[PDB]
Amino acid sequence: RRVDNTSYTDSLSDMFNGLRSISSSEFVRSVNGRSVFTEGRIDAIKVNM
Amino acid sequence: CHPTVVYNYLSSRAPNFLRLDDQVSLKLTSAGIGTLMPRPVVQLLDYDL
């Protein structure tokens, strides 16, 4: 589908963008030597293939 | 008519189990303002003759 003046997207991609991106950094987060994960849970698309 | 139209026509004609080739679809759907192309028509004759 047409998004704006010069760009298009596609229902699958369009759905992928709807996901929250968790900074690379936040994954390797650590506190006093122990890795910790303060972030929530990873928004994801489940593909039953 | 505008290419967009051609797409909608050809693509809705696609019989069961088929789709209009991509590249064709894209070139047609990507056309901008002011572009035009001939209307597709189904040519049927008067067999009885």
From Swiss-Prot, chain A:
The record describes the protein's role as: Capsid protein which self-assembles to form the inner icosahedral capsid with a T=2 symmetry, and consisting of 60 P3 dimers.
Entry's family note:
Belongs to the phytoreovirus inner capsid protein P3 family.
Q: What is this protein called?
A: Outer capsid protein P3
**Assembly and interactions?**
Homodimer. Homomultimer.
The superkingdom listed in its UniProt entry is Viruses
Q: Where in the cell is it found?
A: Virion; Host cytoplasm
**Species this chain originates from:** Rice dwarf virus (isolate Akita)
Curated annotation (Swiss-Prot), chain B:
Q: Coiled-coil annotation: which residues?
A: none
- Under which name does UniProt file this protein? Outer capsid protein P3
Which family is annotated?
Belongs to the phytoreovirus inner capsid protein P3 family.
| Subunit text | Homodimer. Homomultimer.
Segment of the intact protein contained: 244 to 292 of 1019
Q: Which organism is it from?
A: Rice dwarf virus (isolate Akita) (RDV)
Please describe what this protein does.
Capsid protein which self-assembles to form the inner icosahedral capsid with a T=2 symmetry, and consisting of 60 P3 dimers.
- On the tree of life, the source organism's domain of life is Viruses
The subcellular location is: Virion; Host cytoplasm
